[PDB]
Scaffold this active site. Structure first.
Site, PDB file in Angstrom:
ATOM      1  N   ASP D  72     -18.385 -67.972  -9.448  1.00 55.62           N
ATOM      2  CA  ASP D  72     -19.754 -68.161  -9.642  1.00 55.62           C
ATOM      3  C   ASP D  72     -20.239 -66.982 -10.901  1.00 55.62           C
ATOM      4  OD1 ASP D  72     -20.178 -66.016  -7.526  1.00 55.62           O
ATOM      5  OD2 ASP D  72     -20.603 -67.705  -6.281  1.00 55.62           O
ATOM      6  N   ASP D 141     -26.631 -68.363   5.412  1.00 53.19           N
ATOM      7  CA  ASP D 141     -26.798 -69.592   5.964  1.00 53.19           C
ATOM      8  C   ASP D 141     -25.745 -70.400   5.710  1.00 53.19           C
ATOM      9  OD1 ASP D 141     -26.930 -70.105   3.042  1.00 53.19           O
ATOM     10  OD2 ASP D 141     -29.166 -70.031   2.987  1.00 53.19           O
ATOM     11  N   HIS D 143     -23.469 -70.921   2.895  1.00 57.15           N
ATOM     12  CA  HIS D 143     -23.041 -71.072   1.614  1.00 57.15           C
ATOM     13  C   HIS D 143     -21.998 -70.516   1.363  1.00 57.15           C
ATOM     14  CE1 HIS D 143     -24.824 -67.316  -0.720  1.00 57.15           C
ATOM     15  NE2 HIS D 143     -25.673 -67.653   0.151  1.00 57.15           N
ATOM     16  N   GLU D 148     -25.381 -73.977  -1.929  1.00 59.15           N
ATOM     17  CA  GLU D 148     -26.356 -73.880  -0.984  1.00 59.15           C
ATOM     18  C   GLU D 148     -26.555 -75.185   0.041  1.00 59.15           C
ATOM     19  OE1 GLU D 148     -26.878 -70.909  -1.601  1.00 59.15           O
ATOM     20  OE2 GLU D 148     -28.748 -70.453  -2.417  1.00 59.15           O
TER      21      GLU D 148
END
Lengths: 266, 266, 266, 266, 266, 266
Positions: D72, D141, D143, D148
């Protein structure tokens, strides 16, 4: 259960302080019938202590006939260490209000006989009869006071070993060294808290979002001891916006409608 | 809740027996103030009964001023059938210790009026005041005594229909024929057990791993009645290693740290 | 907990009515010791009221020494509006039986001081001592009386804001306009219901299947307040067939065996 | 799935770096058949990049024929801004090893046409055939890369809007101002990752313990996209000790003995 | 998914054997186009192998053109040891039917190169094209073949370390000594199984009830690899009555009426 | 996944209709390259079909080169019966737009050979290559098309027996008599749907809130087959306000800000 959905910590502090003042003033305490207030320490109650001191200085409340009991205290920390709950409470609240020193009750974390200390604390609450309002915060893992996961829901005041997570969480105050955080604390029990006439928990920040979801939508269980409030006839949780993120849309919607008038101080 | 994480059934038996002896000796029972012990049957308490008998023969405990109450009994099984809980208790414990016969209380599974039998049993506990320590085991489905799934958490002594699973589990003792296992039993209730001053549950084997996870990490619910211990102010679970397999690593870690000193008899 | 698994609403009504008649007749109420019956409104109790009126006309029961208390009432609805719970109860039951008007107790939804109304209702129950049997229904979201999600499990009689879902559910009676359904109701609390000696909940239709699963197999929690029956020593749920669809096969199997004889009126 | 339970972030970096070196050297890359390595940024890979640099410097690995693709890049951050993933990668890794500029592939988060950029990146991977090993971290969380909660489990490289919680997490690198973190990033999709021949995720810290539990013990779902590794034939999770705290005792027991030998290397 | 709810293991064996015979006979295998059948060992397939042998002996099926592949084999057990899956298969099935030795394919758990063995097995399946029907059982913890909890849902044939619980389960065949059960086995992977044209799993006994519930009502996850059947276009579960006890009433109601006719055959 | 949180069914229809028109017009269909649209029946698509008809009539879209495939059809209902999905589609859509009869493809629920019919339908889709956009609704229990709970997530077009609950839901269209709804329907499978290039599901009403929560926040499982959209690269859920009530506050917050601009169109 009432849940007050506010946006910021500042608003939570102001709603909380106002609710305490309204209960004291409606109560009209005398020397012979004092109002008994249970109190917490930590980052959470700071805006509430600030707002109560302001209101006292503005002539809105007198603590002359209020007796206080604190929730907990670290075992083995010197009383004058800036981070003992004794110092916290004097620095942030007691030094600024007109409460008589004989009206202040705090657990002695350096008592030689811990069982005797805990027993006398319960006896001192019983001589007044009851705590009329107990204010508290909630831990990241759901603890109410230091009633860590797997604390009995009928527990009384006793010593508890702190979870590694609570020590890491509290290392904030001991300049980020977990090894400086006390390993044990003296704490009122879940049964002790359920005996108060009204319980008000302040919930601030996204770190408390899972604990708030456990309290409001979860089942009663001793792993998240905050769930004991489902069994209390008069519990209030006062929340900021980040802490409500894990609730269902319909749960927040219900409480928003319920409380619209009571949260518009403005 | 305290959880004592030991490795073998032999250690569980020895920790349990020692804890009972320490409570009796600290209590110093007299004829006018007996210690009242609640007792279970089954595969689980065998190492505890062996270790208590040894300690009695070694002069460590006297049961002369101990009154016992058993948890349950099969309905319609002849008292002298080797597998009645009456025979179990005599064979494995009563025959070997110095407890007066008038101090032994057992439910009569062949009583003509079951309601009257159950009511008088509760009345007999009440004339002593309370059970000071109730020892029990846990069923594979989470039952405490024969308080099967969907037994009230405020239940008293009554007759209960055994689940097919409990009968299959107990067919061990009736030479593997489920059709020989009694269909009903008389049992103290969950409310009866919660009234004891201290409750100690022995958990042995991987067959109890889901029941231990329900007790320790699950929520209060009447399907796993062992979860009622979350509501008791003084509950202890004494576990071997296979039964802890379904717990979270952080839960076992906490109890291991907590109990390190108290489990090193060695 | 007892669960009576029947097939149709008609059978549920007949089992319920018979159980009420058996309790009254076994009780033998006098003027000095009345039987105290707690009652509900809604679609659910209709077959039970029909069957009780029939049995009264057939000489099986007299309500001359029965005192009744209803569960709830809408706030701000005119007493003579056909859908007030006052009208419901007269139309469907009181007009047809021989209960003295002085024996009927209903909450006044138009009381000027709501707190005073709720307090006097609790005081009136206490002057009789206790409710011997409280019959109720369950809401689609699990509410018992109008103790909506997040109502305390120790709550007393008070005003409650109805959930949007309950209003939509009840719009049936207000010719499908949710805007005509009252927004608030006066309701006995969960604590009020748990104080009754026996509680009997009627569960009809697939719309109640998730509420029945929460009551029977779920954990105690204040989001489904019907789960409070897990804490009651004498609770009965009388179900038709569509409402049991979300239960486990082994749960229904157990209750079917348990109740075979007691459900074969035929 | 393999899970390598280690104690420390330093051990995780050493294990992971050794595994990359072993795969490269067993592959024997050349100018015509390069080894293709997918790489992450963030706090998690730091001890791995340090160990890899040490191994390269000692003559144990060369990167002259390794082609890299990063997961990314932030949209709208200038390339030379110190927290761009371009700057991170050169500072922490490429500046110290012998990889040719030709072999480095990074998403251009300031491309004129973002849609063209993502599609070309996928094309670039396809021109080499396959990514042989993709190393990544996992978000709090769950990801994986910036996929996401609620990203498709079959997604390809695209622009993605970051969760507020991820912005809070990454604000550490932007002097703790959430307003400083970019709202959008270019990211490889979950399908892009699942196309890699082997995936190794590094999991470090207590903040990752719920994500680790979701990956290992949870179900596959797009809210914790790390759960996609259950569908991959060759996935490895390399863990330090605080990240395993939410797993069951039996899960960590199983991996500890499978990997005993495999981690004894020290 | 189809689920065939039957009462008894004998009925399950008859149903399953009849389905295999119907598929073979509809296929009409020849020397060039063999029917390819995947097979299990263990207690579960015993009534199926008996029924198939009876059908072959009565002239209803021939295996002269059926090619078989077994799911797994113990590593390091000699071929002629009575509990090797090789010995199991010949004793219980191949010794009684007319299958040529050429058509039998079993993993060689004592091959020099285990890695070569697994890859050749996959190659062998590929040379015939497709397995037309793969029959299997399910472990108590949901493992299909020896793809233990946390095996990839896309795994191929490989060596696998057995869970301690599986060793305990299989110790029955090794005179109840866990130390006698091999720690490692060669096994087809989950992806190997999902490549079969149709998969029929036999589920027998109360010990399999949680695995059945995970397969039918749970989510797909690699901890219960039997959940992989949710992704298969033609999966069948043939169940006796105790294995369905953890399903919801509505799930078993649905399958009972879909299969009513289909099981009336008797 | 994209989720478009709107308030009203009218807005959902307008959004959805606009998206279909934009895709068709961007595609520019011709006689050789038709746009292929998959379509649903039921209450849910009504505002979408009305809006599409309005757009066609205003000259914004032509269907002369659109080929349609419907999801399902009742078996054994005559074509011209008003509630056949054939009649629904012509009345509500095809009668008002310019699509040639040649381009309409509907399952023939009264075909001689049902098995031939399903296979030919799949063949027909394959002859055009791909369905470019498949629009659908979701059932109260999460069924997408008539792929009822426990349908394979890789299923193809086939005959399917409808759940009793779906028959109850659809009895509205058969004057509320469940006995009037067909028991069996021909339906595209979940694999058929996942083969479409883009899938848009319309979710309307409080009755769909648990299905929406299962699709967005649940795990993939075959009991709520709408969960299959987690595996699709281009899935869209267009929702009104009551269907989002069971989602978490943070889930709806995330989609609200991603789509803010995208829904401001009004």
């Amino acid at each position: 259960m009432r849940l007050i959905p506010l946006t910021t910590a500042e608003q939570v502090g102001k709603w909380a302080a106002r609710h305490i003042v309204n209960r004291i003033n409606a109560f009209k305490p005398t020397a012979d019938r004092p109002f008994v207030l249970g109190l917490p320490t930590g980052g959470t109650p700071m805006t509430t202590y600030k707002a109560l001191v302001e209101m006292h200085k503005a002539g809105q409340v007198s603590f002359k006939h209020v007796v206080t009991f604190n929730m907990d205290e670290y075992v083995g920390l010197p009383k004058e260490h800036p981070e003992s709950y004794y110092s916290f409470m004097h620095r942030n609240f007691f030094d600024h209000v007109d409460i008589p020193a004989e009206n202040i009750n705090l657990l002695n974390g350096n008592a030689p006989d811990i069982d005797a200390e805990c027993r006398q604390y319960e006896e001192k609450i019983r001589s007044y009869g009851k705590i009329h309002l107990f204010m508290g915060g909630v831990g990241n893992d759901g603890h109410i006071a230091f009633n860590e996961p797997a604390s009995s829901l009928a527990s009384r005041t006793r010593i508890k070993t702190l979870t590694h997570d609570t020590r890491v969480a509290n290392s904030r105050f001991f300049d980020n060294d977990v090894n400086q955080v006390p390993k044990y604390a003296l704490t009122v029990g879940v049964g002790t808290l359920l005996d108060a006439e009204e319980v008000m928990i302040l919930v601030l920040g996204s770190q408390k979002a899972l604990a708030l979801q456990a309290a409001v939508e979860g089942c009663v269980n001793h792993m998240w001891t905050i769930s004991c409030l489902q069994l209390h006839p008069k519990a209030i949780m006062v929340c900021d916006e980040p802490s409500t993120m894990e609730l269902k849309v319909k749960t927040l919607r219900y409480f928003n409608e319920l409380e619209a008038e009571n949260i518009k101080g403005l």
